[PDB]
Ligand binder design. Structure first.
Ligand SMILES: NC(=O)c1ccc[n+]([C@@H]2O[C@H](COP(=O)([O-])OP(=O)(O)OC[C@H]3O[C@@H](n4cnc5c(N)ncnc54)[C@H](OP(=O)(O)O)[C@@H]3O)[C@@H](O)[C@H]2O)c1
Ligand SMILES: NC(=O)c1ccc[n+]([C@@H]2O[C@H](COP(=O)([O-])OP(=O)(O)OC[C@H]3O[C@@H](n4cnc5c(N)ncnc54)[C@H](OP(=O)(O)O)[C@@H]3O)[C@@H](O)[C@H]2O)c1
Ligand SMILES: NC(=O)c1ccc[n+]([C@@H]2O[C@H](COP(=O)([O-])OP(=O)(O)OC[C@H]3O[C@@H](n4cnc5c(N)ncnc54)[C@H](OP(=O)(O)O)[C@@H]3O)[C@@H](O)[C@H]2O)c1
Ligand SMILES: NC(=O)c1ccc[n+]([C@@H]2O[C@H](COP(=O)([O-])OP(=O)(O)OC[C@H]3O[C@@H](n4cnc5c(N)ncnc54)[C@H](OP(=O)(O)O)[C@@H]3O)[C@@H](O)[C@H]2O)c1
Lengths: 344, 344, 344, 344
């Protein structure tokens, strides 16, 4: 049996990993066991005090996040803020499958990392976005996964097919709305319900958001040209969901762009291209590992437009982690990962 | 193979039955086929124009609700407004399993039906609330099921253990908040998003709500005493969820009340009694077939208080329908019905 | 010119006092000036860092909450958590008008205060609910005001006319839903947007909420029967608004109850009795100082039902404070207090 | 006295005009009277059945929308869907002040109008955006006003100072989120609460939205350069508010751009440039006629970023209508128009 530990089990990403594992077929038949659940200060509390939706695990006592407690598990999810997985990965048995939700091993340019995160670059692990060209093969049998950030997942799925086929200019604009669970459950006044309800605001604008270079990195993997990214995130009064509106200049006809998206995504089970006349909505993908995508051309503005909707906690985090865990373990990639949303 | 038709497939309850069937183990192993999907004016359209979250069924063409279309199915869900079940059930075989989400066959007193619904009584079918004393036995192998209303489900789960144990007075008060999907997807000005968002309102107050006699009927099934029900529903700015606050006068001690609930619900897989110090929240049960329940005693007011949270679309209707379907077909009662909520 | 200080200016109640003062006619004609704005940890920041909606005051620097800073003001609003007004009030001049939004001076029974607040009783000041029988006369020319809690404001307006006329039994039940701004802006995980959005929950149930004795106290002021209060508050996903559903057994006819509410409220400018066939909604009173009320009789359950909607930050706090301020200073009671809501 | 009629009084824009008129100083001192309130199918009903927040007018009976009904009024607000206004305005006296919230008289190019609205071009009236260069001159003493659309108001305020100073390129991108009251109150399934709540969706993308040429026309008024507009609107689960994220290739450093916005807006009472390190939020402007603006430069992407927040119903429509009314009547422009938002 694959014994699984979750570090950061009391946070939003850790809770969603547990939700997905509880529903995974390997948990049903005993090939996957849910072992130690650890955190920082929540140690000693029961899991139900943080995740009342996870009633089968509510009685579990949260433990300290120490190598000894996380030891003895074949797979370890790290659902912590960036800064801990580098040292934590080193203390663990190297045979252990380590799936890091944080950013520590995402970036391939050490100088880019130091500019945006202000610490020593730890390195890079296989990127947990299996639909990216080349990425799936690197995850088969791997023992190290860097799960993508939520906004990059939406932006890259929206944009890479057009850019890989040289059908748009490499200067892209991304304005993405997001529910507030993407910010984590650490209490701040700016994330308070009364503040968030009934309001929308852009934040970390004009290149300072740390996902900007992660989008750039993913796009550079499919083109020769110099990539620039204008990325604006906008917080909206929903708990989950990302709707990324992505634009770039183009002179290619719509029919060519449509065919490029059909070719890239016809055999990708989690990507759904909208029928003609329909557009994505975050409500349709909530609680699923799906991305819903539509493309169009603004002829007057000579601008390509791609819309992508994902659940930030599933395809944008925990579902990507479980998807990559499946590939790493040699299990069917779709195990435990529904494409069906929970709407309305 | 059990072939299933869903009448009212384009509505909220029909869409949620379909979501649950797609995840049901009998669908996965071919024991259950999803057959004809019918409606009224939406006949001729594709299901994706109504339920974009159900992408595996998006291509299905909605058919007319006609006995010729519903025939040849081993099971037929009726997810229609009340008024059509009697005729449709007359036209289907007695061996066909018919599961009615509407009210037509819920009430056992013709005079009560006439007073609250203004029409002749159709009769009554086994009530699809398996947790009620005596209900499960009536549902095993049955071919006719009347699924309960969503508010009675919450209220009856909150109250019947105390009342059946003679630990409270039979004059009960229920004030229940509900998300707006409980009203259905028919477009009215009062259900418009701009109206509902940011606002709460009680409606159909002081005994005019048709679920009042349904609550009373379920309580009279566990006591000979003179039941009265003060029921106030309150619409709140959520899409799903019912939180029923239920009260009754008592002089019994809390210890005896908690023991009554633990005895009644210990072996009930969908009922979760909150640990000491915790209270239910609708967010914890969304997308699950669970009910979360806590009880307390207000000594100064000599008042018993029971709180119950359910998802109105799952345990409040479509999950109850599939739960009853499982019992009717001799399948494991929990098949396809998770207790794990989709939160936050 | 009346110089006004606000202690706790960085909080929700303090911000709403300032919003109302900015729109008060005395502010427009110079009779009223907004002086010191004080807090605790927030001292040293600008007001716009806390209340970006108050742009005319955004540049104001928040000052420490000290007697020296607060001195030299004709009126001082205290918008602090309970337990600080006694120590702060005793350091101001007795001729200073002190208006306390907290509970410190609301309760008239020292033993009840100690039970529910766990500290020594400070005493009691004129209660800032002018519509209560006898209350308005105690406020005229006063220099001490204890502003009521938000739930008691709704429950008392819903219930006192029936109880004062001996038309209902004195055992009352109140189930009130509230937007999340009633909990204050101090950051807790339970108040985070992702948690409160899409979810509802009762809290502090079965008589432990500190507003239970405050409701009982107001009701005891209109009757000599023994009062008891079953009070359940319910957090819902809105930022503002309280909808109180209040019930009591009755043997009086509806016409008599209706007449008692018309008599009590016909001359009350902030109280609006719903037209026949209409019911209150919190969205209709947001941003106004109004209460919208309807009453009914559940004949089958021999139960009176009263529904009251207020804005918890206006008539439930800062509007009541400004309303009482007007009375204390001899200004027209409605000055700066609109009855028109901001909907949708 | 100025007698005012409102056509389309039962809708969202008409109701918000009435809210502002009720708080206008001319209404308080008798110089403005609220006369005929008209609609289509809601004629015969009372206004309270549509706008329960407008309790001082709740008793008013809605009348049919006929030119003879609207005659005899010194000022007429038209808050109807496109069409109607032209036919109605032709039958009204040329000495009547007509303020049209619809699009009929906004556009100055008949071929553009035909292409996006599919009807004959009625002409064009002075555009009701007083902050636009040259606009205030045209509004003084005018008897005809075309009020701008909500999204163009936000986009033009965000972009025109940069473009007028030739500091950015004329190919602009706008992605704007909007609360659902922008869609009007006509009941459709796509606007119902359960659909809108918890979901976000772009609509009318890639140049098909009718506000695209309106944005382009406003920008052409400040540059003789060729303007292109990529405009994407996104519906979010709020009832009010527009947050426009506007980008363009930059040819300038932030200091020059900030200075240009300071110069353009320091005089403007409704336009608030955010302090250093603060960004707009729609919650801060709800219920006010304010727009909050911030600008930035993404150096790595060489992209100018401008964020604008307004209330879609106030500065986006009814507030702009009343603002232009003041100017046309020779009244103080800010009369009845607060800059203070109703937050949280
Ligand atoms: N949330 C998303 O949508 C999303 C999407 C993509 C990627 N991610 C990434 O996933 C990671 C988790 O984010 P989140 O949203 O889940 O935040 P969160 O809800 O606040 O949870 C953070 C968890 O990490 C634990 N923790 C914090 N510091 C710790 C320390 N020194 N040692 C051990 N445990 C510690 C916390 O334990 P305590 O309870 O004791 O504090 C908590 O359980 C982040 O790195 C994020 O970048 C998140
Ligand atoms: N929604 C809940 O939370 C809930 C909970 C418990 C019980 N129920 C009960 O389940 C039933 C469905 O409620 P709902 O929320 O799903 O309403 P809904 O969303 O508005 O949809 C109703 C469905 O019934 C179809 N329909 C209406 N009239 C029909 C007719 N003459 N012939 C054939 N089909 C017709 C409609 O087809 P078209 O699309 O063509 O109109 C539609 O698909 C109700 O009786 C309700 O009491 C609902
Ligand atoms: N909010 C409502 O709906 C409502 C309704 C009715 C009555 N009330 C009552 O009004 C009062 C304020 O509630 P709230 O919702 O506004 O809470 P809040 O949003 O969290 O703000 C509390 C304010 O009090 C300040 N403060 C806290 N401790 C202080 C201390 N030792 N010394 C000086 N200032 C201190 C805080 O300043 P810092 O920012 O520096 O911490 C803050 O500005 C409460 O007593 C409440 O019971 C509230
Ligand atoms: N809503 C916004 O945020 C916004 C912002 C900027 C500009 N505008 C513009 O303002 C106008 C009103 O939009 P809205 O949001 O208020 O829509 P709405 O909420 O649906 O109301 C539309 C109003 O127009 C009336 N009406 C409809 N058809 C009519 C007809 N043949 N004859 C007479 N009256 C008719 C309606 O009366 P009945 O009740 O009888 O149907 C109703 O009162 C639109 O042109 C819009 O472009 C709106």
């Amino acid at each position: 049996a694959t014994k699984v530990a979750v570090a950061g089990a009391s946070g939003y990403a850790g809770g969603e990993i547990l939700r997905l594992l509880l529903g995974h077929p390997a948990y049903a038949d005993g090939r996957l066991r849910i072992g130690a659940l650890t955190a920082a200060t929540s140690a000693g509390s029961t899991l139900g005090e943080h995740h009342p939706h996870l009633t089968p695990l509510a009685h579990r006592v949260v433990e300290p996040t120490e190598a000894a407690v996380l030891g003895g598990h074949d797979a370890v999810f790290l659902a912590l803020p960036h800064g801990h997985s580098a040292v934590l990965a080193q203390q663990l048995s190297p045979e252990t499958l380590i799936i890091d939700c944080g950013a520590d091993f995402r970036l391939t340019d050490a100088a880019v990392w130091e500019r945006f995160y202000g610490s020593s670059h730890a390195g890079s692990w296989p990127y947990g976005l299996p639909e990216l060209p080349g990425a799936r093969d690197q995850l088969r049998g791997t023992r190290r996964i860097a799960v993508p950030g939520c906004y990059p997942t939406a932006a890259l799925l929206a944009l890479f097919p057009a850019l890989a086929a040289d059908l748009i200019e490499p200067a892209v604009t991304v304005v993405a709305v997001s529910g507030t669970s993407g910010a984590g459950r650490a209490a701040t006044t700016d994330l308070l319900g009364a503040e968030v309800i009934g309001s929308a605001r852009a934040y970390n604008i004009a290149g300072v958001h740390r996902h900007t270079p992660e989008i750039a990195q993913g796009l550079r993997a499919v083109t020769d040209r110099d990539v620039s990214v204008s990325f604006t995130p906008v917080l909206i009064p929903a708990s989950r969901g990302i709707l990324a509106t992505c634009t770039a200049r183009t002179r290619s006809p719509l029919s060519q762009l449509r065919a490029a998206y059909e070719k890239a995504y016809h055999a990708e089970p989690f990507i759904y291209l909208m029928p003609e006349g329909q557009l994505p909505r975050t409500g349709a993908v909530i609680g699923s590992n799906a991305a819903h995508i539509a493309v169009a051309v603004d002829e007057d503005a000579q601008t390509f437009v791609a819309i992508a909707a994902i659940d930030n906690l599933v395809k944008g985090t925990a579902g990507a982690a479980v998807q990559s865990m499946n590939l790493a373990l040699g299990w069917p990639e779709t195990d435990g990962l529904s494409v069906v949303g929970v709407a309305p």
